[PDB]
């Protein structure tokens, strides 16, 4: 607000307007990113008062009604662990309470209705049957869930327990979010510290130049501070335009993991975490999103002898679904992703051609029921 400097700055023309137009473009993108990640859901779904989710325990990821804001238990851990020279920070369009209402809506839809709330109006389904059709989507037959439902529920509840301990053990788990805070703080402290620099002028204090010198000599010094401070802003705005393109590329990935992992079930290998993907739950965090990706990992293999086909009465039989294996001596058919051996039958198998053609075929009996 020195008038002697302000009058000189007019002669640089539209530079100052195109800095504000560039920073305003970045500021609008931050609300657009936040909208496209969280606002994927047409209605604010809410969970029932009862919690009969087949033995699975979402209490650590559903909203806490006692908290001053309706964040979940894990969203409180995530919100705890991230931690005026003409500069103004502007508020987000969606408050952290509205972001927690969207993660609540996405999570309560996912738990009560599966993929269906993405494709249309949410259709209720019992949670054990939702997990049975998420198992059936990774080539494990649904009875493998219903016969093991208490084990699967205990493994899920235990694995959710490890997330609290992991997030409590070190803040370095949130490294990507904390780095994105630290870079914006570092950039603003650098932008402010550059006001102390001389840029070849007699003094870095603008009222001091205007005291040491008479008009034309003072003007020649002020034009160095105008040049250096204008170059200091153009460097910061250029750096924020590049950093915002990097954050937009991350927001488009989070909007894609929202649509594909949460609103559905991905078959894209290692996209929704390692293992075969079952489902994932969104939790908000300061400046970001956390996905808890639930995945099936196969865990206790046995070696078996195998064959591509078997002979019967000269007919070559192949498995309809699954693969042939030998229990040392007997022959069985099993599903590919879990050992469940069955007697080979005319309805476990299909026939093409005869025993001459297939390399590695073996001789056995196909039982005709």
């Amino acid at each position: 607000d020195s008038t002697e400097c302000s009058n000189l700055l007019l002669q640089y023309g539209s530079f100052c307007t195109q800095l504000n137009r560039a920073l305003t473009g970045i500021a609008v993108e931050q609300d657009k990113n936040t909208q496209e990640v969280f606002a994927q859901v047409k209605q604010i779904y809410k969970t029932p008062p009862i919690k009969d989710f087949g033995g699975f325990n979402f209490s650590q990821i559903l909203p806490d009604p006692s908290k001053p804001s309706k964040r979940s238990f894990i969203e409180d851990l995530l919100f705890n662990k991230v931690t005026f020279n003409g500069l103004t920070v502007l508020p987000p369009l969606l408050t952290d309470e509205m972001i927690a209402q969207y993660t609540s809506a996405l999570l309560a839809g996912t738990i009560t209705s599966g993929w269906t709330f993405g494709a249309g109006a949410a259709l209720q389904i019992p949670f054990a049957m939702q997990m049975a059709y998420r198992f059936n989507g990774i080539g494990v037959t649904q009875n493998v869930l219903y016969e093991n439902q208490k084990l699967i529920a205990n493994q899920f509840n235990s694995a959710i327990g490890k997330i609290q301990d992991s997030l409590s053990s070190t803040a370095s788990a949130l490294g990507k979010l904390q780095d994105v805070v630290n870079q914006n703080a570092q950039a603003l402290n650098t932008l402010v510290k550059q006001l102390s620099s001389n840029f070849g002028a007699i003094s870095s204090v603008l009222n001091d130049i205007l005291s040491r010198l008479d008009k034309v000599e003072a003007e020649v010094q002020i034009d160095r501070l105008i040049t250096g401070r204008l170059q200091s802003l153009q460097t910061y705005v250029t750096q924020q335009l590049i950093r915002a393109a990097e954050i937009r590329a991350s927001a488009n990935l989070a909007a894609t993991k929202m649509s594909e992992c949460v609103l559905g079930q991905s078959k894209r290998v290692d996209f929704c975490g390692k293992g075969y993907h079952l489902m994932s739950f969104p939790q908000s965090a300061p400046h970001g999103v956390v996905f808890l990706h639930v995945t099936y990992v196969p865990a206790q293999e046995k070696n078996f002898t195998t064959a591509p086909a078997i002979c019967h009465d000269g007919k070559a039989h192949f498995p309809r679904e699954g693969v042939f294996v030998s229990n040392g001596t007997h022959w069985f058919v099993t599903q590919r992703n879990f050992y469940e051996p069955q007697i080979i039958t005319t309805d476990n198998t299909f026939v093409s051609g005869n025993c001459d053609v297939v390399i590695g075929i073996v001789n056995n009996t196909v039982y005709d029921p």
Binding site: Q43, I44, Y45, F84, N85, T88, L93, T112, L123, N189
Partner: protein, 414 residues
């Protein structure tokens, strides 16, 4: 807004048209309690005074020179300052000042000027032709004069060569006026060099005694130990003011603070060099400094092809600094506060949106995220669709820019 966009038609939106800034309501200047006044009063109020051939001097240093105590006083029959106007001396600084001081008859005071000639100038006290400093004089017939004549005051009448600027000579050596030998004693062609005005109370003003002080200034490689005294204003708390504490200029809302500076510390700084507090130099309290309130001014508007009403948001500003409504995004003026909630038309920030609605006016409301739906979940209930709709959804993507190319040599020069 029309001028901001360079258009007579404005489409629906929120447009930043200006920057609001609280202006400083008054100016504050603060320096320590004015003390160590330069001892000029020891010279100007002296009982005794010097003979001009042997003038008195004192080295004035490490003090505030209140020249206004001198030049405000109509007591002085002469007050000529060289290079500088007397009022400006309350602003300037010097390494030292010297009170070069003596008595002469009122007529010979005309010899006390830069580069003058005559008995006093050439044989008693010489000023350079480019002097800088103040010649001050007044009639002293009330102090320096006696019945039958005061013969104790003397001036040099004779010298073989002139004294240089600020040079001095006490010698009673006999002036040899020819080839006649003098042997250090008075005689024909052998005359004593010092003579008296013999001041009498009956004298006319050209013969009456005058006291003279010449304040000889200097500025060297040694720092300016003598300065004109700085004035201080009253102090203000809880208002936006322009300020200067010692040499630290700024503009801000000064307040009290609980910060505990060490006894030698004068200024506070925040992490990125910015001043955050000052000690007041008269009453040693720590004032917090906070900048005067400022923020973007945004015009919320429906399109001019629908209405000419607008509402104005002072972003990050409290309404006390500026229907009138305090949002968390800023003071919002000309929009009705509404307890309903709707989809966003125009976004304001911190959960607020605004729109043109029912008689129609601009309304501002907390945005609605969507309709609440308790899904009818139970451990044995499933919902299955009995029918479908084929739906066609348009998705639009940009694929390429306009292909500009520039000859920079023709753009820059041409």
């Amino acid at each position: 807004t029309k001028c901001t966009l360079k258009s007579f038609t404005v489409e629906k939106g929120i447009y930043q048209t200006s920057n609001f800034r609280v202006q400083p309501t008054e100016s504050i200047v603060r320096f320590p309690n004015i003390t160590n006044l330069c001892p000029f009063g020891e010279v100007f109020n002296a009982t005794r005074f010097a003979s001009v051939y042997a003038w008195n001097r004192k080295r004035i240093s490490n003090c505030v020179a209140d020249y206004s105590v001198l030049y405000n006083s109509a007591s002085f029959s002469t007050f000529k300052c060289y290079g500088v106007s007397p009022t400006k001396l309350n602003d300037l600084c010097f390494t030292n000042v010297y009170a070069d001081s003596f008595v002469i008859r009122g007529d010979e005071v005309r010899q006390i000027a830069p580069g003058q000639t005559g008995n006093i100038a050439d044989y008693n006290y010489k000023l350079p032709d480019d002097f800088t400093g103040c010649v001050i004089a007044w009639n002293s017939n009330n102090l320096d004069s006696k019945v039958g004549g005061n013969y104790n005051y003397l001036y040099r009448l004779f010298r073989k060569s002139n004294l240089k600027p600020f040079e001095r000579d006490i010698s009673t050596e006999i002036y040899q006026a020819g080839s006649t030998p003098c042997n250090g004693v008075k005689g024909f062609n052998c005359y004593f060099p010092l003579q008296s005005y013999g001041f009498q109370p009956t004298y006319g003003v050209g013969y009456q005694p005058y006291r003279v002080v010449v304040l000889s200034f200097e500025l060297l490689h040694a720092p300016a130990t003598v300065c004109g005294p700085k004035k201080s204003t009253n102090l203000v708390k809880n208002k936006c003011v322009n300020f200067n504490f010692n040499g630290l200029t700024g503009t801000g809302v000064l307040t009290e603070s609980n910060k505990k500076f060490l006894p030698f510390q004068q200024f506070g700084r925040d992490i990125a060099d910015t001043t955050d507090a000052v000690r007041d130099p008269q009453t040693l309290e720590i004032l917090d400094i906070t900048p005067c309130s400022f923020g973007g001014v945004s015009v919320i508007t429906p399109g001019t092809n629908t209405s000419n009403q607008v509402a104005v948001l002072y972003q990050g500003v409290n309404c006390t600094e500026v229907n009138v409504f305090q949002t968390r995004a800023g003071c919002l003026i000309g929009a009705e506060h509404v307890n309903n909630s709707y989809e966003c038309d125009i976004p304001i920030g911190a959960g607020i949106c605004a729109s043109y609605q029912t008689s129609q006016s601009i309304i501002a409301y907390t945005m609605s995220l969507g309709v609440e739906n308790s899904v009818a979940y139970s451990n044995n209930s499933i919902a299955i669709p009995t029918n479908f709709t084929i739906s066609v959804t348009t998705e639009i993507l940009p694929v390429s820019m306009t292909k500009t190319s520039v000859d920079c040599t023709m753009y820059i020069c041409g």
